[PDB]
Amino acid sequence: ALLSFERKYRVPGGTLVGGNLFDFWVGPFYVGFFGVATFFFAALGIILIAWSAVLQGTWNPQLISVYPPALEYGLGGAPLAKGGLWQIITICATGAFVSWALREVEICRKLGIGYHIPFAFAFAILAYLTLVLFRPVMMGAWGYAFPYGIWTHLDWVSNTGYTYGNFHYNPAHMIAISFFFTNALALALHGALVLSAANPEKGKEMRTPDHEDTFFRDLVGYSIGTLGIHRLGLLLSLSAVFFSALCMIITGTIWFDQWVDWWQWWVKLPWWANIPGGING
Amino acid sequence: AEYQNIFSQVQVRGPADLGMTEDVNLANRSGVGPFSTLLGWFGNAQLGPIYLGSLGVLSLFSGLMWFFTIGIWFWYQAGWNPAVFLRDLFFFSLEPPAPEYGLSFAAPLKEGGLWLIASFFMFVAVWSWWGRTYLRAQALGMGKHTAWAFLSAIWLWMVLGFIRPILMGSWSEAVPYGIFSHLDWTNNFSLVHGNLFYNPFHGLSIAFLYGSALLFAMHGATILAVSRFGGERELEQIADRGTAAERAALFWRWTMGFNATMEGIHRWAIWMAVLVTLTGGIGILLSGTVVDNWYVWGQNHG
Amino acid sequence: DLASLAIYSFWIFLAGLIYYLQTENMREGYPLENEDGTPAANQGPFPLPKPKTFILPHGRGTLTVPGPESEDRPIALARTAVSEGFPHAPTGDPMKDGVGPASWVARRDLPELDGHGHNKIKPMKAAAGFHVSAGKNPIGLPVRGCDLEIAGKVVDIWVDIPEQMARFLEVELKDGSTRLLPMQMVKVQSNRVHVNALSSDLFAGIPTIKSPTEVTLLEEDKICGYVAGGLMYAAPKRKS
Ligand code: BCL
Ligand code: BCL
Ligand code: BCL
Ligand code: BCL
Ligand SMILES: CC[C@H]1c2cc3[nH]c4c(c3C)C(=O)[C@H](C(=O)OC)c4c3nc(cc4[nH]c(cc(n2)[C@@H]1C)c(C(C)=O)c4C)[C@@H](C)[C@@H]3CCC(=O)OC/C=C(\C)CCC[C@H](C)CCC[C@H](C)CCCC(C)C
Ligand SMILES: CC[C@H]1c2cc3[nH]c4c(c3C)C(=O)[C@H](C(=O)OC)c4c3nc(cc4[nH]c(cc(n2)[C@@H]1C)c(C(C)=O)c4C)[C@@H](C)[C@@H]3CCC(=O)OC/C=C(\C)CCC[C@H](C)CCC[C@H](C)CCCC(C)C
Ligand SMILES: COC(C)(C)C/C=C/C(C)=C/C=C/C(C)=C/C=C/C(C)=C/C=C\C=C(C)\C=C\C=C(/C)CC/C=C(\C)CCC=C(C)C
Ligand SMILES: CCCCCCCCCCCC[N+](C)(C)[O-]
Ligand SMILES: CCCCCCCCCCCC[N+](C)(C)[O-]
Ligand SMILES: CCCCCCCCCCCC[N+](C)(C)[O-]
Ligand SMILES: CCCCCCCCCCCC[N+](C)(C)[O-]
Ligand SMILES: [Fe+3]
């Protein structure tokens, strides 16, 4: 049940709540109060979802979907059959994600590391909450949230998108994308570099972080370095998600027309607005 | 408060690092360029040297040749007026030849020829850049991972512009050179193909792209969390595991019940990313060639 | 048809890739063990990969993983329960004993070397033409612990030559001897360096280095471990 170097770290302490009560593992998993919290919220989330399936008629996870309350409900509560379960499951979901994060913080404390991980996760949780809590509330109804089902959530995406034309024109959505693509470029390169040094040509000796800078400088004129690249991946990722949140929190709220049209501010600026020729003259 | 190691507090500079020399022809490295205090808060402050060479000179010349072919066409679309040029910069587009010209080069400079010229240039630019990715590694005696992984990105690019238009018997299936036009091409491609959300490869691509963000968020954060035990120093933690590698492995196994090595996290990393464009280019290449409607295909899968 | 053959091929490919990735990530820490160091019964469904061997640069030998796992060091902890899965209480001072968040590993007692086989890390005085280029130069600043008491004075920055980077602050104590403190665990301020992990009285306890112009990987581990463990193990002394 333990990695060969593990026991020296399995010492008491680091917990935020209930002191020694839940300070222990089950197999490889640390528990803690937040272990108990996430399990409770998770189980109740899944039982509500399982019960929701029965009301729908399927047990096929490719067909099961839980829809928010219809928009007439506004921000009120709904009947379980028609948005209630979702409303409760969302509370169990948020419960389980946030308990998972504070559990990670407890893991951090015991291990004496920085809290960067739970911090990072908090951004994912914030993107989730934007879609199901902040935007729906600013919009006056839970109906605007996405439904919990494998394909039906993709529907909500396509539908939500094409409410505003080609969503490509949302400018925050362009920033987010660029960060997602850039992150993935950076992930490929970073993996491949370290691997290319740890796994040199047959018979040769492992290279060195000097080789890693040398290679990249040779190649593009700059090397960010090994602290840098991990600051970078973290930043690209969190930015990608920061801007995903941003590009939906404004959609439906401050902007609700066709996004292509937002770009008219630019084309119509009075110093070139009426000049003939080009695509807009 | 407690320092997080997202920015450096103190910067330190020595003599310019001109770098290692293994089989590298030094006659072709530039000199070091300026140092940047700004960059030094985050990564390295040194710029250069770059290794120009024949493939460097080759790629860069074509790169620019491609970029000016499009920009000349834009300037022309602006009727030579720089007001209009700034103004409509994303509405301009260098569009491939019409369907009627198939895979020929029969068509005027305007109306397709300029697109082809610019594409040819892009082709030599990228492939030569690719070879430079391999050769630079070999010179230092390092692995060809960067080249194998860059190839996966090349795949998707090749598929969109070259393999798929060839397999559909026409260049007009290829992507135009414009900021807004190429987004329109994207949206139109999905509409004309039954909605790509129904392409299983397209969804796989998304899981890897979302997963790339998840993973690099995870990894970077983890390495910053264990930077107080020398974590960034990953190649020495491979050669000689330290408590940084152990604390990291155990954060994750106590969190989700399994973990990685300081070497193997980078195999997860390179693969997660590389499978974005891999699966992605399959999905595109199959579209209009084998499957005309992803919805339809989904219904039976035949 | 071709497309549905392609998707079926892929899920098979991906199962093999996950298999490969998980065995690759089993070249450290396996086999799994019980709390008394013996081989555990269930090891999971993945086997151990065939060994691979890194050739280390500077005559510094080879690493074959997997291989004989062994802490090569005493571990001062006792069980607190009659069954698995519970915490193991330090038997002495966990800071001194090097357990818990004060843990260190028995790395090679030699300094990490650079690409030319020169010591990668040096005090700035031995580091040819290296100077602070931006930020507050900490050299000369008094060091405060979390008990808001001064533990010493900064006397130098220990730098990474290849990566041009401050790695440690070397610190002179009331008795003239010095210690390294990791840069990552200090706050450089206009008029002071502040260290929350540790209280003034715990600075003497920081593990020393055998030689004044190099640090070994074993010593780095002992130092970083120690000062990190103070976040848990000084706590009653910390105050604000
Ligand atoms: C994948 C399916 C579509 C597609 C869908 C989308 C969508 C959707 C979006 C983009 C976006 C971008 N796309 Mg596109 N994109 C495709 C293929 C390409 C190719 C190519 C040669 O195959 C290129 C060069 C680009 C280029 C770009 C950039 C303009 C922009 C940010 C990319 C990025 O982060 O790069 C990674 C980071 C790097 C540092 C690499 C270099 C980045 C620069 C900017 C490259 C392009 C600059 C170009 C040569 C010159 C621009 C003109 C001047 C500004 C005047 N795309 C295919 C055809 N692309 C985003 C955008 O903001 O559009 C307006 C966006 O929202
Ligand atoms: C027709 C559709 C429209 C469109 C409409 C929309 C809409 C609508 C949305 C996006 C959003 C996004 N789009 Mg757009 N988009 C289009 C075309 C594109 C293209 C493209 C190539 O053309 C790209 C690259 C993108 C890119 C993106 C991303 C920037 C962003 C999604 C990531 C995200 O939010 O993560 C954030 C991550 C999360 C929310 C994950 C949360 C994870 C939680 C915290 C943990 C879960 C635990 C869970 C229970 C699992 C348990 C595991 C157990 C072990 C089992 N779009 C087209 C034109 N797009 C979305 C966005 O920005 O949302 C904020 C959004 O809402
Ligand atoms: C981000 C913007 C949109 C959105 C747009 C899209 C688009 C577009 C696509 C997906 C796709 C997926 N999305 Mg989605 N998706 C959104 C929000 C979510 C949330 C959430 C709680 O916020 C979850 C859990 C998911 C989950 C999923 C997966 C079922 C599938 C592959 C994703 C993946 O690997 O991601 C990255 C994460 C990992 C690699 C780690 C593991 C994640 C696992 C697989 C999550 C499984 C969840 C499970 C099936 C359902 C809950 C289980 C409970 C215990 C009951 N999405 C928001 C609303 N999503 C793709 C698909 O291919 O088919 C539907 C796809 O094309
Ligand atoms: C309305 C639009 C359609 C749609 C249409 C398409 C189409 C069409 C395509 C994608 C593709 C992708 N889409 Mg989709 N997509 C939609 C909805 C989504 C949503 C969402 C939230 O709804 C998401 C998250 C995505 C996500 C994705 C990605 C997983 C995938 C692109 C991977 C990548 O990195 O490409 C970017 C990477 C590259 C383009 C490779 C570039 C490498 C080259 C060699 C480098 C060029 C350098 C050049 C010389 C310039 C030099 C610059 C200077 C040096 C700086 N789509 C909707 C349903 N999508 C692509 C794919 O693979 O689909 C299966 C694709 O073709
Ligand atoms: C901020 C940048 C990126 C990021 C970071 C990130 N994610 C993280 C972390 C971090 C740093 C963790 O530490 C944590 C982890 O353990 O990772 C392995 C996590 C995590 N990210 C996860 C998934 C995930 N992350 C995503 C995204 C991202 N995560 C970003 C791209 C996505 C996307 C893109 O869609 C997904 C699907 C999990 C693997 C893990 C968190 C596990 C967790 O929260 O467990 C507690 C809850 C349960 C075990 C299940 C209970 C669920 C509910 C009660 C019921 C189900 C409701 C749900 C809404 C239904 C979903 C239906 C869908 C089909 C729509
Ligand atoms: C696995 C998929 C991911 C991936 C991986 C990947 N990409 C890679 C690699 C890898 C492993 C490389 O090794 C290679 C590289 O060099 O990285 C640094 C590369 C690369 N990925 C690149 C871009 C790129 N990657 C993308 C995507 C992705 N790459 C995926 C997410 C995208 C997207 C999303 O569109 C882009 C745009 C390039 C930076 C680089 C390959 C460079 C190349 O082939 O260049 C040809 C050279 C030229 C064209 C010369 C420059 C031309 C410029 C247009 C001129 C400069 C413009 C300037 C604004 C004007 C100057 C005026 C003058 C008068 C001075
Ligand atoms: C002159 O003006 C100044 C100085 C101001 C410069 C300004 C220039 C400007 C404004 C440049 C603008 C450039 C833009 C907007 C570029 C954007 C391009 C985009 C978004 C491209 C996106 C995707 C391209 C793809 C997918 C192309 C793939 C191409 C191939 C795989 C190559 C295909 C090759 C072919 C068809 C040729 C084969 C023929 C032979 C004979 C081998
Ligand atoms: C609300 C979404 C429902 C969650 C269902 C969880 C079970 C996941 C099984 C996915 C496998 C699909 N299938 C049936 C083809 O094997
Ligand atoms: C190397 C990383 C492995 C992670 C793979 C994640 C699997 C996600 C499944 C996506 C579902 C695809 N789809 C739409 C065809 O069903
Ligand atoms: C990629 C889709 C799969 C979703 C992840 C669900 C299971 C992963 C967790 C396995 C950990 C179990 N254990 C005992 C090995 O720790
Ligand atoms: C694609 C997400 C990752 C899922 C694949 C990993 C499965 C769990 C690994 C089990 C090995 C852990 N253990 C405890 C047996 O050593
Ligand atoms: Fe790394």
Swiss-Prot record, chain A:
**TM region positions:** 32-55, 83-111, 116-138, 171-198, 225-250
Q: Which residues lie on this side of the membrane: Periplasmic?
A: 56-82, 139-170, 251-281
Question: Which GO-annotated molecular functions does the record name?
Answer: bacteriochlorophyll binding; electron transporter, transferring electrons within the cyclic electron transport pathway of photosynthesis activity; metal ion binding
Q: Which SUPFAM superfamilies match?
A: Bacterial photosystem II reaction centre, L and M subunits
Keywords, in A-Z order: Bacteriochlorophyll, Chlorophyll, Chromophore, Electron transport, Iron, Magnesium, Membrane, Metal-binding, Photosynthesis, Reaction center, Transmembrane, Transmembrane helix, Transport
Q: Which residues are listed for Fe cation binding in this entry?
A: H190, H230
Q: Where in the cell is it found?
A: Cellular chromatophore membrane
Sorted alphabetically, the Gene Ontology cellular component annotations on this record are: plasma membrane light-harvesting complex; plasma membrane-derived chromatophore membrane
Binding sites annotated in the UniProt record for (7R,8Z)-bacteriochlorophyll b: H153, H173
Under Pfam families, the record lists: Photo_RC
Where a ubiquinone binds, per the record, is at: F216
The record gives the membrane topology as: Multi-pass membrane protein
Gene3D superfamilies tied to this protein: Photosystem II protein D1-like
Q: Which GO terms describe its biological process?
A: photosynthetic electron transport in photosystem II
Give the record's family classification. Answer: Belongs to the reaction center PufL/M/PsbA/D family.
In UniProt terms, what function does this protein have? The reaction center is a membrane-bound complex that mediates the initial photochemical event in the electron transfer process of photosynthesis.
Subunit-level organization: Reaction center is composed of four bacteriochlorophylls, two bacteriopheophytins, two ubiquinones, one iron, and three highly hydrophobic polypeptide chains (designated L, M, and H).
Name of the protein in question: Reaction center protein L chain
Q: Which organism is it from?
A: Cereibacter sphaeroides (Rhodobacter sphaeroides)
Curated annotation (Swiss-Prot), chain B:
List residues binding (7R,8Z)-bacteriochlorophyll b.
Answer: H182, H202
Record-linked Gene3D superfamilies: Photosystem II protein D1-like
The residues that hold a ubiquinone are W252
UniProt record similarity statement: Belongs to the reaction center PufL/M/PsbA/D family.
Q: What membrane topology does the annotation report for this chain? A: Multi-pass membrane protein
- One GO cellular component term noted in the UniProt record for this chain: plasma membrane-derived chromatophore membrane
Q: What species is this protein from? A: Cereibacter sphaeroides
Q: What does this protein do?
A: The reaction center is a membrane-bound complex that mediates the initial photochemical event in the electron transfer process of photosynthesis.
Location(s) in or outside the cell:
Cellular chromatophore membrane
The answer to whether keyword Iron applies is: yes
Q: Which residues span the membrane? A: 53-79, 110-139, 142-167, 197-225, 259-285
According to the UniProt entry, its GO molecular function terms are: bacteriochlorophyll binding; electron transporter, transferring electrons within the cyclic electron transport pathway of photosynthesis activity; metal ion binding
Q: What quaternary arrangement does the UniProt entry report?
A: Reaction center is composed of four bacteriochlorophylls, two bacteriopheophytins, two ubiquinones, one iron, and three highly hydrophobic polypeptide chains (designated L, M, and H).
Gene Ontology annotations of biological process type: photosynthetic electron transport in photosystem II
Instruction: Return the protein name.
Output: Reaction center protein M chain
- Note whether Electron transport occurs among the keywords: yes
Which InterPro entries does the UniProt entry name for this protein?
Answer: Photo_II_D1/D2_sf, Photo_RC_L/M, Photo_RC_L/M_CS, Photo_RC_M
Instruction: Locate the residues binding Fe cation.
Output: H219, E234, H266
Q: Which gene encodes it?
A: pufM
Q: Which UniProt keywords apply?
A: Bacteriochlorophyll, Chlorophyll, Chromophore, Electron transport, Iron, Magnesium, Membrane, Metal-binding, Photosynthesis, Reaction center, Transmembrane, Transmembrane helix, Transport
UniProtKB/Swiss-Prot annotation, chain C:
Q: How does it sit in the membrane?
A: Single-pass membrane protein
Where would you find this protein in the cell?
A: Cellular chromatophore membrane
Its main subcellular localisation, reduced to a broad class, is: membrane
> Looking at the keywords, is Transport present?
yes
Q: Which cysteines are joined by disulfide bonds?
A: none
Requisite cofactors: a bacteriochlorophyll; a bacteriopheophytin; Fe cation; Mg(2+)
Q: What's a BP term from Gene Ontology annotated to this protein? A: photosynthesis, light reaction
Instruction: List the molecular function annotations (GO) for this entry.
Output: bacteriochlorophyll binding; electron transporter, transferring electrons within the cyclic electron transport pathway of photosynthesis activity
Q: Which UniProt keywords apply?
A: Bacteriochlorophyll, Chlorophyll, Chromophore, Electron transport, Membrane, Photosynthesis, Reaction center, Transmembrane, Transmembrane helix, Transport
Q: Name the Gene3D superfamilies on file.
A: Photosynthetic Reaction Center, subunit H, domain 2, Photosynthetic reaction centre, H subunit, N-terminal domain
Q: Which residues lie on this side of the membrane: Cytoplasmic?
A: 22-240
Name a GO CC annotation attached to this entry: plasma membrane-derived chromatophore membrane
Q: Where are the transmembrane segments?
A: 2-21
Textual note on the cofactor? Binds 4 bacteriochlorophylls per trimer.
Note the Pfam families from the entry: PRC (PF05239), PRCH (PF03967)
- Matches recorded under CDD domains: PRCH
Q: What does this protein do?
A: The reaction center is a membrane-bound complex that mediates the initial photochemical event in the electron transfer process of photosynthesis.
Q: Which family does it belong to?
A: Belongs to the reaction center PuhA family.
Describe the subunit structure: Heterotrimer composed of subunits L, M, and H.
Record's protein name: Reaction center protein H chain
Source organism: Cereibacter sphaeroides (Rhodobacter sphaeroides)
